[PDB]
């Protein structure tokens, strides 16, 4: 875990303090705009449930993926920036995102 954004943020957000998580996606949009996706395009989740929603527009995201040499305690990530549609599973009241299903 070093200075690239992925190594830094994964550690800061308590994802890699006690393990190395293989992949994680960060969304660079306002919280309310991401929560707004729960009332957008309803789609089926990969698991078949129907509480998933796809964003009308693409969103700024950063994909973090472990390199093939990464090993606890020295997790290492490859950082990839992209703009894509996000698909989230929503639940509760208020109806908010609880899982990131995919990115298109």
């Amino acid at each position: 875990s070093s200075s690239n954004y992925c190594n830094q943020m994964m550690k800061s957000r308590n994802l890699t303090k006690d393990r190395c998580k293989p992949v994680n996606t960060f969304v660079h949009e306002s919280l309310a705009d991401v929560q707004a996706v729960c009332s957008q395009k309803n789609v089926a989740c990969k698991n078949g449930q129907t509480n998933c929603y796809q964003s009308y527009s693409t969103m700024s995201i950063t994909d973090c993926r472990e390199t093939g040499s990464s090993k606890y305690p020295n997790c290492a990530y490859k950082t990839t920036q992209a703009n894509k549609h996000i698909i989230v599973a929503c639940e509760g009241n208020p109806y908010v995102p609880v899982h990131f299903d995919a990115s298109v």
Binding site: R13, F26, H28, E29, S30, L31, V96
Partner: peptide
């Protein structure tokens, strides 16, 4: 403790 919504935010949101 941490709710599922809170966890989603800590793990995926970077406004």
């Amino acid at each position: 403790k941490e709710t599922a919504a809170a966890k989603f935010e800590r793990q995926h949101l970077d406004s």
